[PDB]
DNA sequence: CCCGGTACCGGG
DNA sequence: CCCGGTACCGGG
């Protein structure tokens, strides 16, 4: 059908962009920043990936420090 | 805050007005002349996988009484 | 901005 | 009727 755009999709928001034809969806507007679609995308969960880098990061300086 | 589905609707992924609707069942519920019952705790049921399943139990008790 | 958690579309 | 799968609300 008519699916919603990227920056919507990220961040869980209605997107009215397949109505708003050529030019960007309301919510994409707002936040100056380019409509893009694909309907393959998928939503990166932010909190939990930063969590991670943190940890995987300490780990490694860790055991570099380790000589 | 939001509004949940009524019983039904949830069951059939289907709209449900059955709030803006008021007593009166919701719109998919009289059409389908049941009634229109809410429960917030209530969880959709996968027919074809249950029909699947106890096909499946039946047809390996009918090959080991067949295989007799 | 982010997301847990639903409502519901579209299609078989 | 049934559902796979995705849009979006409601809130911190
Ligand atoms: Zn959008
Ligand atoms: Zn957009
Ligand atoms: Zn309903
Ligand atoms: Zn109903």
Same mark, same amino acid.
């Given at each position: 059908?008519?699916?919603?755009?990227?920056?919507?999709?990220?961040?869980?928001?209605?997107?009215?962009?397949?109505? #708003?034809?050529?030019?960007?969806?309301?919510?994409?507007?707002?936040? !100056?920043?380019?409509?893009?679609?694909? #309907?393959?995308?998928? #939503?990166?969960?932010?909190?939990?990936? !930063?969590?991670?880098?943190?940890?995987?990061?300490?780990?490694?300086?860790?055991?570099?420090? !380790?000589?």
């Amino acid at each position: 059908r008519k699916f919603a755009c990227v920056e919507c999709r990220q961040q869980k928001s209605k997107c009215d962009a397949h109505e #708003r034809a050529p030019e960007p969806c309301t919510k994409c507007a707002k936040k !100056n920043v380019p409509c893009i679609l694909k #309907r393959d995308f998928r #939503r990166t969960y932010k909190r939990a990936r !930063n969590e991670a880098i943190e940890k995987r990061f300490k780990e490694l300086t860790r055991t570099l420090t !380790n000589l």
